[PDB]
Symmetry: C5
Subunit: 346 residues, 5 copies
Amino acid sequence: PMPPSEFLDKLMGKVSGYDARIRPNFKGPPVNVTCNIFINSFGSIAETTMDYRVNIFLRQQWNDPRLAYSEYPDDSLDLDPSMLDSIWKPDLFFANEKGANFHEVTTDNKLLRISKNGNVLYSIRITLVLACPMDLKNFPMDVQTCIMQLESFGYTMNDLIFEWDEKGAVQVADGLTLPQFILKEEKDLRYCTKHYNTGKFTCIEARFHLERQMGYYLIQMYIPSLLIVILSWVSFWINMDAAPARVGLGITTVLTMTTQSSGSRASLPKVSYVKAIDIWMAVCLLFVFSALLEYAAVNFIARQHVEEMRKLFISRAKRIDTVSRVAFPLVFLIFNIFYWITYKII
Amino acid sequence: PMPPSEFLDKLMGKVSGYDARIRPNFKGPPVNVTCNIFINSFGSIAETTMDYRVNIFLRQQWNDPRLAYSEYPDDSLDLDPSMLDSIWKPDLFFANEKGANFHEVTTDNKLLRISKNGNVLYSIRITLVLACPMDLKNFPMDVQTCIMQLESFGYTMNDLIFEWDEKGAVQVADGLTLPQFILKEEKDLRYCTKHYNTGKFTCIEARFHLERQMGYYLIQMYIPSLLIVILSWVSFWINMDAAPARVGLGITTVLTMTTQSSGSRASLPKVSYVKAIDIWMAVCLLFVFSALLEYAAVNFIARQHVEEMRKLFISRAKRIDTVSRVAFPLVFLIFNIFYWITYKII
Amino acid sequence: PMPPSEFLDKLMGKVSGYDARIRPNFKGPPVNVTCNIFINSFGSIAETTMDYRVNIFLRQQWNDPRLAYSEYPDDSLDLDPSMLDSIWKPDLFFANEKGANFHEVTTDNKLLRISKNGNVLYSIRITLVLACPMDLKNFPMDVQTCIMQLESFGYTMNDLIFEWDEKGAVQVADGLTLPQFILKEEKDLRYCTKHYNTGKFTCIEARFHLERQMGYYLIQMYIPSLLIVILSWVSFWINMDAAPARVGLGITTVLTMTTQSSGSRASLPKVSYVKAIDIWMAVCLLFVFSALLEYAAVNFIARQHVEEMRKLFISRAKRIDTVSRVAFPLVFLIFNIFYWITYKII
Amino acid sequence: PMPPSEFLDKLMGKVSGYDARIRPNFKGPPVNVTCNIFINSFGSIAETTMDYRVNIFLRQQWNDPRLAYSEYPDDSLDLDPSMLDSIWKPDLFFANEKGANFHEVTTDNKLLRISKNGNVLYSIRITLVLACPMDLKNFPMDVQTCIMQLESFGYTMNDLIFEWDEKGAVQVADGLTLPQFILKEEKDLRYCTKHYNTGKFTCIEARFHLERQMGYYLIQMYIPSLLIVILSWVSFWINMDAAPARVGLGITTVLTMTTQSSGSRASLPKVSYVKAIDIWMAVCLLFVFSALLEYAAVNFIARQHVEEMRKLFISRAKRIDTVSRVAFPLVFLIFNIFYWITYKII
Amino acid sequence: PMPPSEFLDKLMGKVSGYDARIRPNFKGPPVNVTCNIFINSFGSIAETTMDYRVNIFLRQQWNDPRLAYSEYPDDSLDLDPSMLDSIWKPDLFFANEKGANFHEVTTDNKLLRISKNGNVLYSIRITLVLACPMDLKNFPMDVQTCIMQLESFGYTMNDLIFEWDEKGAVQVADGLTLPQFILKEEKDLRYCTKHYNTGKFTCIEARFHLERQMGYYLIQMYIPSLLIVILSWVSFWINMDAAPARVGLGITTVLTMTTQSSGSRASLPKVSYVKAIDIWMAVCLLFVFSALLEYAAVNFIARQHVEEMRKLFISRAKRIDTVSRVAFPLVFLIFNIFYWITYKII
Ligand SMILES: *[C@@H]1O[C@H](CO)[C@@H](O[C@@H]2O[C@H](CO)[C@@H](O[C@@H]3O[C@H](CO)[C@@H](O)[C@H](O)[C@@H]3O)[C@H](O)[C@H]2NC(C)=O)[C@H](O)[C@H]1NC(C)=O
Ligand SMILES: *[C@@H]1O[C@H](CO)[C@@H](O[C@@H]2O[C@H](CO)[C@@H](O[C@@H]3O[C@H](CO)[C@@H](O)[C@H](O)[C@@H]3O)[C@H](O)[C@H]2NC(C)=O)[C@H](O)[C@H]1NC(C)=O
Ligand SMILES: *[C@@H]1O[C@H](CO)[C@@H](O[C@@H]2O[C@H](CO)[C@@H](O[C@@H]3O[C@H](CO)[C@@H](O)[C@H](O)[C@@H]3O)[C@H](O)[C@H]2NC(C)=O)[C@H](O)[C@H]1NC(C)=O
Ligand SMILES: *[C@@H]1O[C@H](CO)[C@@H](O[C@@H]2O[C@H](CO)[C@@H](O[C@@H]3O[C@H](CO)[C@@H](O)[C@H](O)[C@@H]3O)[C@H](O)[C@H]2NC(C)=O)[C@H](O)[C@H]1NC(C)=O
Ligand SMILES: *[C@@H]1O[C@H](CO)[C@@H](O[C@@H]2O[C@H](CO)[C@@H](O[C@@H]3O[C@H](CO)[C@@H](O)[C@H](O)[C@@H]3O)[C@H](O)[C@H]2NC(C)=O)[C@H](O)[C@H]1NC(C)=O
């Protein structure tokens, strides 16, 4: 017999009329390319740019009847990646690329094998920086849906149709963890067929659901925003005579709370709508600012203090501290129930 | 019959005299290239660099009478993108590129089809980082106009003329949203014909209007700049005896206001002129600094306090707190009306 | 005799049937490629991205019986790196590349020599940015294990098998130091054989253990977090009459401690779990917040002060300062023993 | 007649002996290349890196007598940019490149036309990141001089001489504005002929003067550094009895002034010399620190207060507040005159 | 005669047997390549990455007896940089590259001339980002030694030997200044011959000494760390009765000093050892913290005050303020002498 690279030069050379610019089944039914991906790495999900970097193995399988040998005795013929300019390949691209590249270290990372009946496996390694629009209406408790979609570019729907295969169309690597998110195991697979004025082009896509990990935000920006509210409660257990204390406590807490509010959106996109970390800060702004306005009611009623009625005006000024010691730590707990039930329903 | 790639080698080969370095209609009328773009992605509109990243499909259509076949029975002949060095193509470029690249993942993202009469469609995918000069005179309420312009580089006006087509010269993708801006639906299309000492070169351009979303700035830098003004009002409801309080309230507010003023321009270009976020901070600097100077009038008139006249000097010192409780929250509201009417007219 | 480049064109030319697309020992036993690396540079171990940049010399040795000359008198024949497209080479790649490149300054940095029996040495220079998942459960005292793994891409296990050689499979450069870490001298070498639906592909890997240097974190974020706890102790040595002092000391310390807590995770990945620098800050939050609640017990018992019993209520209010001067600096030392024994066992 | 690309293959082919490796007028007088640039974009003038990004059209004109046709009837023959490897071109480079690239979007952005007598116009588009050493001795009021210089690399002075042309050697685009600087209209043009041990190489250069816009620094770092000085003046209008006030005012101002001093050099190169923004901060450090030392003279003379002499010692302690209310706002204005006259002369 | 490019095709063509893959003096003595560099630009010496960017002209001279013409009448023959693949060139590389690139703007920046006896000058332009390990034990007063080393990659010591030439082996450009450092004029030149298991490879290197400019650190982080120590001295000149003052002065200074300590290492590598800017901050931490503990001794001895003995206990409490006004500004000056003599000896 003869070696396969000399045998594949007979299948692809000047003889046999194989022309690599012409799709299989020409002037016939369209080419049914079936696809599946294998996610090696995932992550660096930025939100300022609203993008995420994935690192996939893109496998494509089609049928090319001109490559159907019957004399060489094997069942699969590998190609050198140097000879990948010699067969037809589908012009797949990603409709939200935002920059992508191959991997060409120590060899082009490309695989190509040809079965006997003409089935062609073609596996390459791609690094993508895909774009997904973030929806941050409920921000530490959101379930993002970042997608990726695989169109054709030169061939219309009556020449080339993409399909996901039925045998596990999206595999994920074995120990693929993410720092901030978790990747849910149910991955949607649906069509996204595009219509332009050039024609109608095929498109398949895969949705990935990325549920967050709330445990980070629960440590940096919910509990230190809950202690400073309790500092504003301890002004109530000091008498109406340490005026440099209860004012100075109602100033340093309400102005370290503004730093918490501005520091809550340090690395976020400047979205117009109000998000679920903003109706925690702008309500805990309100509790630490109502503790300062409580003392400004005490020291104003007390300075208004005729003997008999003003002894009750001092007693009116102590009756308001027998209420705000109980009202504020049991209205803030009513809000703390209406908040966490709202975002564990929506 | 014969397959089209063998047929197009007859239209472009050594026979028939087709020379890819020579424009259509040579020594004749100029080539009327008509253009339209399709914006896939838009955004990352930085203002430190004053640029924005767009991701377009650039379609070009011209007429090439040497490619007018009449024997092959179809109506459109696709090319392989490998054979794009074999026809004439217009040397379009972007006059404010600032860096740009093609997309070459799994295939060169290029499309080329040739009709029977010689009409050539040519669609490529480009990522641009275009430069637009920002005008930030009224900064959270501005309507930017960031443009893009498509010149020729080697052919003058008497050889190649660009036109926008009449059938929707700028399409935008279906769900294209922006984080900070909104893209207005009216897009200007006008000529920008350049004159150099080399010649006069054709140019068409498209204006994009990018109205901001004020809802972000309304949460971070208008309301926390409006609470700290109200902290400087609560010094008035404390008597002229808590000297560590009303001074300490007129210091911490007026120096957390400087942090608001410096934090207002954290990620902005260092422009020379004064912008609409600066005449909100440098007026709310003035209200929280006039509350400190109000107490320095109280505690100086009171320390000046002969029995009969100085009892009115204490009463003069309380008459000024029966005025500044009403004057300052009803002069700040007069400014708050003159401000928001001014920037919802201009 | 004749020069070696004319001699190697006899070994690789049109004569002798050497085909560079066909592995050695075709239709036979697999090719035993043996590998070892030489780490020139190491480091820039980022944790936001969870990656590290290495700069290696990748040596590969296999056996190619078609290159076994016997007439030329030397024992080793170098190649020009221009003629590296003319022999077979293993298609090694790194299964966690995340971007990598060759070095091509003044010459392609590639080495290739061929012995007499057919042994082929092949040494190239690669810069890698490898991905390793960080485990930060005990963060300033952790021993990371960042790995690198060398698969095949086109050849399955029955065609190409990777091995580490027995003579020092991972060398490290002479004075290779790291800024933050130290590289332990025991390096694990184990197999990582992959199974896909394409086939089973060979894989070898090398574990690197990266023990940190605790001496940085001991200066920035343990001792300044230990002085501010001692500032909250000095409130106890001031009487229950300087109410602007002991409150103002129990506010500035407990709110500069929040800046220490937020500044503790300035450049860290937003992990969900709680790490060993967080149960030092959120316990030293508790000591500086219990010094403020100690005074709120003193000034509330003292303001509650009938002649005989209230003289003991003042004495009850001084008995609590004869306890908290000794309890708090000898409970914080009990925690300071339970902490550092826990993370010098785990 | 025949088309020009077939005509230029007669001027440059195997016939006529045109060799693209050999300069015009060989073994004769040097080639007089004349140059002029056209600045499309300018800016991103960083000072940490001390570089600036320019985007030019580099036009070069020389004379090549071997390209002097006389039979083809036109007056100018364009080239395809694909055929730019076929004539001689000057090996110009930029002696302070620091990285540069061409622009190759939709076509190589290169222009080449050949007149009848042999004059060759050659216009390319380059993006440069040029290096200019910043001189920051007087920092918000400095006039930078950032240059660019165009040497030869392989040909010495007796083979190739660069010249600026007399007809406007540096053009600037129509609406080219800069965010921080303004580009003065007088641009110096002078020679920079280099001497190495290889030979003497030609060099021309163009100076650009970049006067700043002081209006940004006048809003962020001169007026907020002028209000905090006036806060330190308002300690004088409070009596010598509010010891928590005048000390607390002489501490918060003098320590928010240190943040102004460190925030003054947030994004500057760490230069050794003292600059004009540093002798404004380190003098306004001195005024807000002399207001604290003024009170430490008052409360120390007052606590030193025998009946008759100490009544004047209280009166000595009020005589010092009848001086520092007028001395400090009329010594700070003497400095404010010596400062702004000094940097509007130098 | 005939032009040199036709003459050099006779020296390098199919005739004369010149093979560009075979070094000069084959099967003979090694090739003595002599080198010297010319530093155009230097700097951007980062310390987070521990690297520095240099921009050199690398000149190499060797002897190639096959290029020794004797008939053409000149003394030097330039090459086109297009014909640099036609002679032998040494495979030099930089053993600490960390990324490097050529410069290819308007022409490949390469020079090549061949003398009559066969001497070959070869000058290229390279941008390097070289790695140097920083030693920061004495950080604002350190003399770094950042090196660069030039190995061979494919040829061992018995085939190719690098040498520095005796006539000024490292030139520096005329006005090369650095922002933070100064480049000392004595540059060490020494051998660095490497031994691997492949062989022994030649290596030469050049040390550069980079003495810092202390004048920046003397303005930002020594004098503002020296004023805050003097603020902690002014607590001594206020009596033991303004308890909100001397405590509030011993809190704001000792907690703005922690910001100085954390801000001292904002842009530094996280090294384990203690550096000379850290034993200035952590000693000026100690002086501003001993001023707070001095008042906690005063107000505790005074509150301990039977008539006769306690009048001396008040006098004991004023005797400690007649000592700490002189002890602390004359112990801090003893440290300020032991510090600056220590780092101007080491
Ligand atoms: C690629 O896959 C497509 C399906 O997505 C195939 O298209 C379909 O092919 C059938 C022939 O097998 C076409 O004919 C139909 O046959 C059924 C009987 O099986 C008959 O009941 C129908 O009336 C019709 O005649 C069918 O129209 C066609 N559908 C479309 C939408 O094109 C295609 O054949 C596959 N091509 C290859 C090369 O595998
Ligand atoms: C490309 O489009 C341009 C228009 O932008 C065409 O130029 C114009 O072509 C006409 C011929 O159709 C020229 O002749 C004019 O004809 C009218 C009658 O239709 C006559 O009234 C005028 O006096 C004149 O003779 C016209 O001068 C020309 N205009 C310009 C500015 O060049 C051009 O023909 C188009 N080329 C192709 C190949 O489609
Ligand atoms: C590459 O290395 C592999 C080992 O990883 C070699 O595979 C082994 O080769 C032996 C022949 O030397 C095969 O035959 C065995 O021989 C022993 C006697 O030595 C006999 O007791 C066994 O029953 C068996 O017949 C062995 O099966 C094979 N093992 C595997 C897993 O393939 C291989 O030969 C090496 N190839 C080259 C080109 O060096
Ligand atoms: C390129 O430009 C240079 C000038 O920068 C030209 O060099 C000068 O050329 C003249 C000939 O025209 C040389 O001869 C001189 O002629 C004058 C009379 O015109 C005579 O009085 C002098 O004594 C001398 O003979 C002159 O030496 C030469 N100068 C230099 C510095 O080389 C050059 O000819 C131009 N080349 C081309 C191809 O245009
Ligand atoms: C390149 O430079 C090396 C030196 O680094 C040259 O190597 C030395 O060459 C001499 C011949 O000139 C060798 O022979 C010695 O000659 C002296 C008399 O001059 C004699 O006393 C010694 O006993 C010895 O025979 C010498 O061994 C050799 N040294 C080494 C280390 O190789 C080399 O010749 C130069 N090559 C070229 C092409 O310039």
